[PDB]
Design a protein around this nucleic acid. Structure first.
Ligand SMILES: CC[C@H]1CN2CCc3cc(OC)c(OC)cc3[C@@H]2C[C@@H]1C[C@H]1NCCc2cc(O)c(OC)cc21
Ligand SMILES: [NH3+]CCC[NH2+]CCCC[NH2+]CCC[NH3+]
Ligand SMILES: [Mg+2]
Ligand SMILES: [Mg+2]
Ligand SMILES: [Mg+2]
Ligand SMILES: [Mg+2]
Ligand SMILES: [Mg+2]
Ligand SMILES: [Mg+2]
Ligand SMILES: [Mg+2]
Ligand SMILES: [Mg+2]
Ligand SMILES: [Mg+2]
Ligand SMILES: [Mg+2]
Ligand SMILES: [Mg+2]
Ligand SMILES: [Mg+2]
Ligand SMILES: [Mg+2]
Ligand SMILES: [Mg+2]
Ligand SMILES: [Mg+2]
Ligand SMILES: [Mg+2]
Ligand SMILES: [Mg+2]
Ligand SMILES: [Mg+2]
Ligand SMILES: [Mg+2]
Ligand SMILES: [Mg+2]
Ligand SMILES: [Mg+2]
Ligand SMILES: [Mg+2]
Ligand SMILES: [Mg+2]
Ligand SMILES: [Mg+2]
Ligand SMILES: [Mg+2]
Ligand SMILES: [Mg+2]
Ligand SMILES: [Mg+2]
Ligand SMILES: [Mg+2]
Ligand SMILES: [Mg+2]
Ligand SMILES: [Mg+2]
Ligand SMILES: [Mg+2]
Ligand SMILES: [Mg+2]
Ligand SMILES: [Mg+2]
Ligand SMILES: [Mg+2]
Ligand SMILES: [Mg+2]
Ligand SMILES: [Mg+2]
Ligand SMILES: [Mg+2]
Ligand SMILES: [Mg+2]
Ligand SMILES: [Mg+2]
Ligand SMILES: [Mg+2]
Ligand SMILES: [Mg+2]
Ligand SMILES: [Mg+2]
Ligand SMILES: [Mg+2]
Ligand SMILES: [Mg+2]
Ligand SMILES: [Mg+2]
Ligand SMILES: [Mg+2]
Ligand SMILES: [Mg+2]
Ligand SMILES: [Mg+2]
Ligand SMILES: [Mg+2]
Ligand SMILES: [Mg+2]
Ligand SMILES: [Mg+2]
Ligand SMILES: [Mg+2]
Ligand SMILES: [Mg+2]
Ligand SMILES: [Mg+2]
Ligand SMILES: [Mg+2]
Ligand SMILES: [Mg+2]
Ligand SMILES: [Mg+2]
Ligand SMILES: [Mg+2]
Ligand SMILES: [Mg+2]
Ligand SMILES: [Mg+2]
Ligand SMILES: [Mg+2]
Ligand SMILES: [Mg+2]
Ligand SMILES: [Mg+2]
Ligand SMILES: [Mg+2]
Ligand SMILES: [Mg+2]
Ligand SMILES: [Mg+2]
Ligand SMILES: [Mg+2]
Ligand SMILES: [Mg+2]
Ligand SMILES: [Mg+2]
Ligand SMILES: [Mg+2]
Ligand SMILES: [Mg+2]
Ligand SMILES: [Mg+2]
Ligand SMILES: [Mg+2]
Ligand SMILES: [Mg+2]
Ligand SMILES: [Mg+2]
Ligand SMILES: [Mg+2]
Ligand SMILES: [Mg+2]
Ligand SMILES: [Mg+2]
Ligand SMILES: [Mg+2]
Ligand SMILES: [Mg+2]
Ligand SMILES: [Mg+2]
Ligand SMILES: [Mg+2]
Ligand SMILES: [Mg+2]
Ligand SMILES: [Mg+2]
Ligand SMILES: [Mg+2]
Ligand SMILES: [Mg+2]
Ligand SMILES: [Mg+2]
Ligand SMILES: [Mg+2]
Lengths: 191, 260, 125, 148
RNA sequence: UGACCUCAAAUCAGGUAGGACUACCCGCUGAACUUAAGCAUAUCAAUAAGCGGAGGAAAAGAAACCAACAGGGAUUGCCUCAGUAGCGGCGAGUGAAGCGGCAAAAGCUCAAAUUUGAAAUCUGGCGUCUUUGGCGUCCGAGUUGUAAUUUGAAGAAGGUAUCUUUGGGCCCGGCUCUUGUCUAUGUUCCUUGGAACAGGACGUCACAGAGGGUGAGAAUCCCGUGCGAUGAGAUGACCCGGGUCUGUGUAAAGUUCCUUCGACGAGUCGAGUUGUUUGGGAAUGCAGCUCUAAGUGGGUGGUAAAUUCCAUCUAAAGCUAAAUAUUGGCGAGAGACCGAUAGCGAACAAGUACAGUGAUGGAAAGAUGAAAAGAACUUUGAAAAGAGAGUGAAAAAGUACGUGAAAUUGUUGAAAGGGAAGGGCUUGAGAUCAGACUUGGUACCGGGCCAG
RNA sequence: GCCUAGACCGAGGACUGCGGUUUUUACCUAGGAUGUUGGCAUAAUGAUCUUAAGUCGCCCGUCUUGAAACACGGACCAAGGAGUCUAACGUCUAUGCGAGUGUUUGGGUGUAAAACCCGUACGCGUAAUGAAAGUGAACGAAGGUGGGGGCCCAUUAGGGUGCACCAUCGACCGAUCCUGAUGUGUUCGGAUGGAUUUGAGUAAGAGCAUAGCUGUUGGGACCCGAAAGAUGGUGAACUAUGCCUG
RNA sequence: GGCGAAAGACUAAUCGAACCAUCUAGUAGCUGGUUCCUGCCGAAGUUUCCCUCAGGAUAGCAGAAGCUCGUAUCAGUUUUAU
RNA sequence: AGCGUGCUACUUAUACUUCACCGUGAUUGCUGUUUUGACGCUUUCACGAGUAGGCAGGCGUGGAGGUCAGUGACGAAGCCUUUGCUGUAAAGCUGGGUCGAACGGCCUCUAGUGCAGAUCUUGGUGGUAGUAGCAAAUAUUCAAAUGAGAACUUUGAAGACUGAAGUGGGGAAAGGUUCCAUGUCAACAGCAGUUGGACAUGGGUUAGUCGAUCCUAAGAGAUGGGGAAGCUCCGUUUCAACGUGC
């Protein structure tokens, strides 16, 4: 049962696995039908874009802090800053998120600029609007017209300024202070 | 095969002691199926050994760069007359390869006009080869929607389609292809190099943008045409050159004389 | 080549649709070409064969024979012509069955519906 | 392809390469990793020492995002400078104007100190650096700027 | 003499449920074979069988979420995380989630509020009309609470600068679905053949050289194919484009600011214990029993506890398309699949014949010929049949039907044969086959084979 | 030294060589058979089949130390009949690119399951080590010594340079143990110098991907084969026993 | 489970636990079989561990692929010295 | 022609020697004459046992891409055959006969790809073998009729038996047309057949009084209720407001 110098394997095939084998023979068929659904949905509502405008948000965790991506909806504060009520915004292609808030100014300002850019390119029709004006427009792709753009990393030339304390020493001292903060505070309180 | 084929029986082995093999047997009585062997790959009406499954591997991955390597090699082979002739194309009356035709042939809309152009440019003897090559397929594949076989004709490559695809659609053996989307199934049919390709002028001039050159970057992202491992592919002149022949020792006899 | 996704190139499906065709479908299946004279007279090239048409046999051992259709025997996929008979050693005569595609119509049996059909097909009645 | 397999070559020979004495059987020795302490001990001790037993402390609900910190060495640090401006930076770089290398924005957590730098000032922005990496960066007249 | 409450009866007026199908779906219940080279925890498996309940999808779903970031933001699925953290006689084994890329995206509703200057709400009967309903009226329900108003993202009541938006019904189109009708070019010549659909010659059409039929391989004989054109029926508060009639818009809704408020789900949360389950480990979920709350309270923050903070949501009430699943149903298109002992058990009057008391079990079986032209008639025979004849391209195709192998068998011919036969080697005999007078060159030159 | 009888064979296919005789740039017996004669080509000759004779020859397959066995299967014939596919892997090989590599979850596109195109992420690799907190790879020409193919200078030999690789002594990184500078939230920090210790490490990257054979593990798992176990159902027309009615 | 004047008897030719279908192609260190040709190479029944003794793993024996080199320094042998 | 011993000759293994041929391994040379095969040609030497097993090169089969503008109704495929040829072989090709609609060579791809065995599977067929056998229940015979045909049918005559607890005359269960008439003999009636419970065509079962139907028996089982997740279990007037009353 165990023989030769081989890696030890974990092949989880002791259940009735053959009754639950999903082979994706329909990958191409699903691609084509997905494209047809996408075309029909666009042509139904043209020239209105098929995608609602989405915000830009920082990705969570220490591993994806650096990246920025499309969020779910603009916060109520952001829409307040651009003077759009959420109920109205949902009817002009803007997504709303009551759950997200703005602790910091950077994401708030980015999304306010994004909303103002969309509002400048928005044209809302009405009863007085004729089919000549409606036909004068093309169905744009909002996800590409207002793309999520990563802030550029700092590069180029800058003056070198060398502090007396090294960066490694700074990190070591920060670690030590965090590690012994509680016991040092207890000792000082007792003293 | 069906997942339950050969297994729709309640057959049970009789065991030993009844002077018959220990294969499972059908129970009951009153029919001739009763007492007959079941479930075995050797048994009439049993299931096959290792019944075929749908989760067999059907599609095969090929590295994109290697696939492009092969596409470039097949395109290059289309310009070698010996390869096209060994490939079987009736190209003896074409004055040079590649065969490039003017762009008016991108706009012919009738099959009659397209056939006239093929005749004019010398590519209709290969169509006649396709016509004369029609045979009933040998084997049971003719019961499966593959009833006739025939040769492959010229591949006509265009840059703009103004009716050429439909004009050549019904001509037997002729394939049409945009210069933007060329693949090995058309460029080397049967894995055999040397497809007879008729280029329109637009397609021929677009080739250099599609695959790039030393002065033009390819439209394919980050793609460069491959490099050969040998610079002079004619090794006879390398061997019989001044540089090599000036430093070699004199040759012996083609056949050693028998001395004992 | 066929383009429609509603058209099948299956040999088994085509043969099943042929051999299980209803009598009404077999009426269309048993079409015959018109002679050159009727083709230029009516500007129609083929019609479903009918009972009282006159035909000329153009293929087979009875090629050159002429006669009036006696029955469109749709069950056997054949027509029986007036005097195209095989004489058994019994002495009795049985009609010879001929496919309508192996004859040409030389005289049409006309009525209001045949005329409407000819005008429908772009012809002149 | 099956035509290349040795099953095609064993046709006509009685045992199909399995032997007349051994008689290819269902599961002699057990299934899987059976008998790893009893009759497959000679195999596991020889080829997989350390297999049995516990070492170290458990960690309930370990989130690997916490430990994300890709390394970049100093001999690979100048590959983060723009290729079109690398030679100009390597020539015209000084204390007054040195290239900034944002390692976090390129996907690195710690700067390590293997290799040698060009004797050219650089400003390195990192979450973490090693002691020798920062000593070597300062020696060429550069600086390490801690970020988060 | 009458209310009310609770509970009954009626063949009272009008409704509704049950049962079926099985592939997917929501739950309950629940093994063992098996693996551990034995075996009991474990594994198989939170699987099979059993039970209850749906739909075209179901379920889930707009955080009592994830996190620990510079924060994300309903649900679902894919790729990845990851055979990882973890669980495990820490053995065999097993094993998720957050982040990230994508498919699809859609949001919301009650309870808790005095309408209190007016139960403003609703089922039903009766009448009537333009009838998936409107109007009128009368009982009834209902104050032990039916409407409007609000749902935490808020919101209410006052004050406030004013601004921005807007209801419904029919008629023709478009889109979607189904369906009817209509369409290019040889049956020209020769040969073979029973038949031309074969070969050859000359051609034609081609946005049609897919497929099928017709007496053999037919683009051009027929149906179709390709290209479109043009009618009919449907369907859609919840698709738009136009018309047209009513809009009862001091109405409804949003927007800024100030003040006062801001109700928010209990045998529930939570705790103990028991059983089961989970990767969940001093206990992941579920369930039983015991205990049983609170109001900046409550839950969660993956090591039990007390103390102090912090973060994040807001349970114990509810609805909701899409992306996802689909050995079933309905309709289609296909294949490097099988080719009648194969492929479904079933290509056929197959779940048939037949067996079994019963649950159940369950076959074998395709092919004359282009066409029955399925052999008139004569003769022998009791008849079946035979012999002539006849049809057919063929009867070396006669339904005991294409081809018609082997085992086994008859006849004819050849040969051998004292208690087996068969085999190898070698030669004889007999039979069969082969080859140089060559693709010989001009009486001769020369050659081939076997020999001295 | 000389004479003399017989048998089997004749590979090769212009010349080239070594010798010999030299009367000779000629000849020979000297790097493998030629000459001549007869017969035959309706045939002498060769092959096969059948058979006789001589001689030898036990029934195959199987397990087994040992089978013709008085061991097992096999009356005969036809058709069917047994190492497969998949998930994850080891070695080797081929191929593409290469400090990168992998288009195909998806998107674009299409003559529509094809072919063609696109990119973020992600996987693997480019860093290890420790249980972990954590730390994290140049004294030197990326080291010395002995070899080392090849190259350079030579001219037997000899010198120079020596990649891969081998043996050996070192250096660097992590862990373990020891020492403990300036300093300090006075308990932290950890410079510096060491140690018969230890790592699947560094020491001018080698990997990633596809495919093939072979091997591995889980799967019905090369094919056929239990005695059993479990879940849900069907039987008292036989029979056992009670009851009711004859 | 039944039933048993008791034999483990009988419970539809089935009884020391009926019959039917399914789990199920249950597992088998055990028996049987395992399908074309030629060419080249060619074993083991021994070591150690195992509820191990009809079985495995391990080492040995064997094949294949090669790689670095090219007489370098090898040997189932002798001689001489010890 | 025995035993001990010496000598000469002679006999013959797949062994040894020389030579031919096959293959394997090594080895010589081959590009200004390499020259449309250098994966080729060529020189030389040695070697050849083999189970289990490994590897290599080939033969054959179904299907797929390409090619031979391949074969074919003037005969494809299949099958039979001392018609032969080629290959060490797996096999390939071919003459004749039969037959009637498709099929092959080559470069590649692919696999449900090769049978003598598995008390293998399904179908078919032998020897045994014209063999075992067709022997319980007393028993048949003569004549005529019918018929192609009579041991077996019909009629007559006789001889017998069952012997009223029947081989008689009815029924219950069970069968289902077997009943009756006419025709009829392919199969069935283990000989026969003119006969038949066979085969074919028709005909045939008449109820107020005979049964069923109704009653209750052992028992079965709704309702009201009570269990049970539930399939359903209990209970039979039970903790019930129980009359479709007369
Ligand atoms: C053998 C195939 C059957 C069985 N299966 C499986 C179960 C099932 C269940 C269904 O509902 C649960 C159902 O509903 C439609 C259909 C079916 C089908 C029906 C099908 C026959 C049906 N095929 C289509 C046409 C047709 C025409 C007829 O004349 C006709 O005669 C009876 C029947 C039919
Ligand atoms: N999943 C089917 C088997 C059910 N067996 C339950 C698993 C028992 C193991 N519990 C894990 C130990 C508790 N942490
Ligand atoms: Mg089958
Ligand atoms: Mg074939
Ligand atoms: Mg083997
Ligand atoms: Mg064996
Ligand atoms: Mg073994
Ligand atoms: Mg032990
Ligand atoms: Mg009523
Ligand atoms: Mg199992
Ligand atoms: Mg076990
Ligand atoms: Mg076992
Ligand atoms: Mg056991
Ligand atoms: Mg189930
Ligand atoms: Mg339904
Ligand atoms: Mg859906
Ligand atoms: Mg739902
Ligand atoms: Mg909420
Ligand atoms: Mg979420
Ligand atoms: Mg589990
Ligand atoms: Mg009313
Ligand atoms: Mg045809
Ligand atoms: Mg709440
Ligand atoms: Mg517990
Ligand atoms: Mg449970
Ligand atoms: Mg618990
Ligand atoms: Mg809720
Ligand atoms: Mg379906
Ligand atoms: Mg079948
Ligand atoms: Mg069958
Ligand atoms: Mg037949
Ligand atoms: Mg014939
Ligand atoms: Mg015939
Ligand atoms: Mg026949
Ligand atoms: Mg025979
Ligand atoms: Mg005798
Ligand atoms: Mg002989
Ligand atoms: Mg002879
Ligand atoms: Mg010779
Ligand atoms: Mg002998
Ligand atoms: Mg044996
Ligand atoms: Mg044995
Ligand atoms: Mg023995
Ligand atoms: Mg033997
Ligand atoms: Mg013996
Ligand atoms: Mg015995
Ligand atoms: Mg035995
Ligand atoms: Mg026997
Ligand atoms: Mg066979
Ligand atoms: Mg990457
Ligand atoms: Mg680490
Ligand atoms: Mg290294
Ligand atoms: Mg047990
Ligand atoms: Mg009874
Ligand atoms: Mg007893
Ligand atoms: Mg006893
Ligand atoms: Mg019994
Ligand atoms: Mg019992
Ligand atoms: Mg098996
Ligand atoms: Mg079994
Ligand atoms: Mg054993
Ligand atoms: Mg050997
Ligand atoms: Mg044994
Ligand atoms: Mg003597
Ligand atoms: Mg000899
Ligand atoms: Mg050998
Ligand atoms: Mg062998
Ligand atoms: Mg196949
Ligand atoms: Mg031909
Ligand atoms: Mg033939
Ligand atoms: Mg035919
Ligand atoms: Mg071919
Ligand atoms: Mg097979
Ligand atoms: Mg056989
Ligand atoms: Mg065998
Ligand atoms: Mg047998
Ligand atoms: Mg048999
Ligand atoms: Mg006898
Ligand atoms: Mg007897
Ligand atoms: Mg008497
Ligand atoms: Mg008596
Ligand atoms: Mg009686
Ligand atoms: Mg009778
Ligand atoms: Mg008889
Ligand atoms: Mg008889
Ligand atoms: Mg009868
Ligand atoms: Mg009575
Ligand atoms: Mg009673
Ligand atoms: Mg009851
Ligand atoms: Mg009840």
């Amino acid at each position: 049962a165990i023989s030769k110098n081989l890696p030890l394997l974990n092949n989880h095939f002791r259940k009735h696995w053959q009754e639950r084998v999903r082979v994706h023979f329909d990958q191409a068929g699903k691609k084509a039908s997905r494209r047809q659904s996408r075309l029909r949905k666009a042509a139904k509502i043209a020239p209105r874009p098929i995608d609602a405008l989405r915000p830009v948000v920082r990705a969570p965790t220490v591993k994806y802090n650096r990246k920025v991506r499309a969020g779910r909806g603009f916060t109520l504060a952001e829409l307040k800053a651009v003077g759009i009520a959420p109920k109205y915004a949902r009817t002009i292609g803007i997504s709303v998120d009551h759950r997200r808030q703005n602790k910091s100014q950077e994401t708030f300002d980015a999304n306010v600029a994004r909303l103002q850019e969309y509002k400048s390119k928005l044209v809302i029709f009405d009863k007085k609007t004729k089919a000549s004006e409606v036909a004068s427009f093309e169905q744009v792709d909002v996800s590409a017209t207002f793309p999520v753009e990563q802030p550029a990393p700092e590069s180029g030339l800058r003056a070198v300024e060398v502090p007396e304390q090294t960066a490694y020493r700074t990190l070591r001292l920060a670690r030590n202070e965090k590690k012994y903060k509680g016991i040092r505070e207890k000792r000082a309180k007792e003293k | 095969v069906a997942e339950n084929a050969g297994h729709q029986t309640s057959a049970e082995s009789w065991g030993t002691g009844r002077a018959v093999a220990r294969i499972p047997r059908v129970g009951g009585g009153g029919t001739h199926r009763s007492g007959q062997a079941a479930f075995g790959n050797m048994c009439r009406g049993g299931r096959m050994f290792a019944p075929t499954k749908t989760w067999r591997r059907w599609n095969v991955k090929v590295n994109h760069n290697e696939k492009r390597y092969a596409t470039a090699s097949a395109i290059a082979a289309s310009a070698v007359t010996s390869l096209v002739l060994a490939r079987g194309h009736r190209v003896e009356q074409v004055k040079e390869l590649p065969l490039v035709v003017s762009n008016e042939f991108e706009s012919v809309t009738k099959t009659k006009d397209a056939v006239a152009v093929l005749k004019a440019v010398g590519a209709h003897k290969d169509v006649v080869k396709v016509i004369k090559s029609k045979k009933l397929r040998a084997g049971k594949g003719k019961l499966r929607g593959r009833r006739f076989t025939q040769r492959r004709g010229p591949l006509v490559v265009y840059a703009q389609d103004n009716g050429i695809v439909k004009a050549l659609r019904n001509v037997p053996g002729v394939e049409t292809a945009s210069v933007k989307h060329l693949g090995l199934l058309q460029l080397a049919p049967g894995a055999h190099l040397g497809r007879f390709i008729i280029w329109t002028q637009g397609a021929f001039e677009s080739l250099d943008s599609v695959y790039g050159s030393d002065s033009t970057k390819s439209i394919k992202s980050g793609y460069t045409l491959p490099s050969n491992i040998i610079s002079n592919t004619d090794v006879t002149r390398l061997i019989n050159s001044a540089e090599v022949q000036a430093v070699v020792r004199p040759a012996g006899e083609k056949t050693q004389k028998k001395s004992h | 080549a066929k383009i429609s996704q509603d058209v099948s190139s299956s040999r088994s499906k085509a043969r099943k649709a042929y051999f299980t065709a209803s009598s009404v479908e077999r009426r269309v299946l048993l079409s015959a070409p018109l002679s050159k004279e009727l083709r230029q007279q009516y500007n129609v090239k083929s019609l479903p064969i009918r009972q009282n048409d006159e035909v000329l046999v153009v293929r087979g051992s009875k090629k050159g024979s002429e006669g009036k259709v006696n029955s469109v025997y749709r069950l056997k996929f054949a027509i029986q012509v007036d005097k195209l008979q095989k004489e058994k050693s019994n002495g009795a005569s049985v009609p010879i069955n001929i496919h309508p595609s192996k004859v040409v119509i030389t005289k049409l049996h006309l009525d209001k519906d045949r005329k409407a059909l000819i005008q429908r097909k772009g012809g002149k009645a | 392809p099956t035509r290349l397999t040795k099953t095609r070559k064993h046709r006509g020979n009685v045992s199909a390469g399995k032997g007349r004495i051994g008689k290819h059987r269902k599961h002699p020795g057990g299934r899987g990793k059976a008998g790893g302490q009893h009759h497959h001990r000679t195999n596991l001790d020889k080829y997989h020492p350390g297999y049995f037993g516990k070492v170290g402390m458990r960690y309930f609900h370990k989130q690997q995002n916490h430990f994300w910190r890709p390394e970049i060495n100093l001999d690979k640090l100048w590959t983060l400078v723009d290729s079109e401006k690398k030679d100009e930076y390597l020539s015209k770089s000084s204390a007054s104007a040195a290239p900034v290398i944002d390692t976090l924005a390129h996907g690195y957590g710690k700067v390590l100190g293997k290799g040698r730098l060009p004797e050219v000032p650089v400003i390195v922005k990192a979450r973490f650096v090693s002691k020798l990496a920062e000593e070597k960066i300062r020696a060429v007249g550069g600086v390490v700027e801690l970020v988060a």
